[PDB]
Write a protein that binds this ligand. Structure first.
Ligand SMILES: [Zn+2]
Length: 140
């Protein structure tokens, strides 16, 4: 689990979004495994605006932060999970690293702030849904 809180926005894995997330839907993209919902409280997270390919992610299944190199946001074929059928996910970034189902929502960050959240895993690879292209997250 895990979320990004920036301004009046909550960013979560679409597949972990709650009733309240869907009741306050701002934007969702099934191909990206992202959902954004509105918040009453002002969020403090800074979204990275950059093309960094290195950063640190939180891995709940190891209670550890790992430094990783990751690929640029891409259309990548992702195997069946249970939450999704074996399909293409867009704006996905892979790194060599540990990822289990409950690691989703783990934040990936560089020096410029939040890059994305854990979205996929398996075969010793971790996939991160990019948020750095969502410029609208940093106004109203
Ligand atoms: Zn960066």
């Amino acid at each position: 689990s895990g979320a990004i809180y920036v301004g009046n926005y909550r960013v979560v894995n679409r597949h972990l979004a709650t009733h309240n997330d869907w009741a306050n839907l701002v934007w969702e993209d099934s191909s990206r495994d992202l959902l954004v919902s509105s918040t009453t409280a002002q969020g403090c997270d800074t979204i990275a605006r950059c093309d960094c390919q290195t950063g640190v992610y939180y891995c709940s299944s190891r209670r550890k932060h790992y430094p990783v190199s990751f690929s640029k946001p891409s259309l990548i074929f992702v195997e069946a999970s249970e939450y999704y059928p074996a399909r293409y996910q867009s704006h996905l970034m892979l790194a060599v690293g540990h990822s289990e189902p409950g690691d989703c929502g783990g934040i990936l960050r560089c020096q410029h702030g939040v890059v994305g959240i854990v979205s996929t895993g398996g075969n010793g690879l971790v996939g991160f849904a990019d948020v750095r292209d969502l410029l609208w997250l940093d106004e109203e």
